[PDB]
Ligand binder design. Sequence first.
Ligand code: HEM
Ligand code: HEM
Lengths: 149, 149
Amino acid sequence: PIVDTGSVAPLSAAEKTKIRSAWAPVYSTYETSGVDILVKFFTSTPAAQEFFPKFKGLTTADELKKSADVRWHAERIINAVDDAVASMDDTEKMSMKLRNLSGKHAKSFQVDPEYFKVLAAVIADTVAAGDAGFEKLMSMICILLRSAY
Amino acid sequence: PIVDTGSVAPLSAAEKTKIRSAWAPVYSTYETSGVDILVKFFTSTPAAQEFFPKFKGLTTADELKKSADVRWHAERIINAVDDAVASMDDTEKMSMKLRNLSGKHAKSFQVDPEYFKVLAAVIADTVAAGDAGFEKLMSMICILLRSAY
Ligand code: HEM
Ligand code: HEM
């Protein structure tokens, strides 16, 4: 499954190709996919809801999907993942960008780090459920998002 | 008209109210509005086109509107304006955020500063053409976007 500690083996050329292929369709309509992913996560994980101050009041999927706040947040998250996919060949660049992001989550947003892998799980499930390559990528992302904690 | 140098008088309580009212509808569907605004600007201002490297190839509105790159850029711009609107009562916060943005445009993106007021004009025209209050807000934004040049 998706891990958020330790280390994972590098991505093989074959895994990268599989990932790019599976990701493309999802990213094409990122504003729709991203919202579905965030909404699904938010609704099925009550404990995490307190970390989204701007969502106070919204409870049903309909309320959420109509909120510009929800859409903007979802679009930013989905695009951060997109940047990681585009940087799979440049692991150094991928790290820098995510380390910076980790700092924001730890110092400014103050979000509980345990939820990174939960949302990542939803993303993986939507893009290519069961694919070990994508799970590896998600794990890399989660490990880096926790680096500043 | 919109200016990008000097200084403009503070926004009066009345002007802020007018702005919030006119902005709300537009922001509700920011991903559509934003794209229309960016596309309109891009197509009617050939000189500026060279500053959008990722748009090379796209020439017609249809090609542009279908590009995820165009959509993402448009969504980021429209939201930067939204942040300014939401910070009208905290001029200090508005400045910090825009000064940071100015730096990116000057050091990393290398865009010609003369085009800020041209795009701002399109935004104003769409939201509330003729409103002096909105023009004042747009001028404040443009002046701050040029601060790092
Ligand atoms: C693995 C998925 C994750 C990625 C890739 C990610 C990415 C992002 C990005 C790119 C931003 C925008 C930061 C900015 O505007 O400078 C952000 C903001 C934020 N993220 Fe994360 N995030 C992730 C998971 C989470 C989780 C699980 C939570 C909640 C427990 C969370 C809560 C937040 C909050 C509260 C903000 C600030 C939103 C705002 O105030 O506008 N993120 N995240
Ligand atoms: C008054 C309107 C303007 C605002 C509020 C604005 C806002 C933004 C924002 C928020 C970003 C995202 C930066 C990031 O991701 O960190 C951005 C990127 C950018 N802006 Fe500006 N901008 C404005 C006008 C312009 C103009 C007129 C040009 C072109 C001559 C321009 C060219 C760019 C470019 C090239 C990028 C980088 C896009 C990329 O590589 O992804 N912007 N702008």
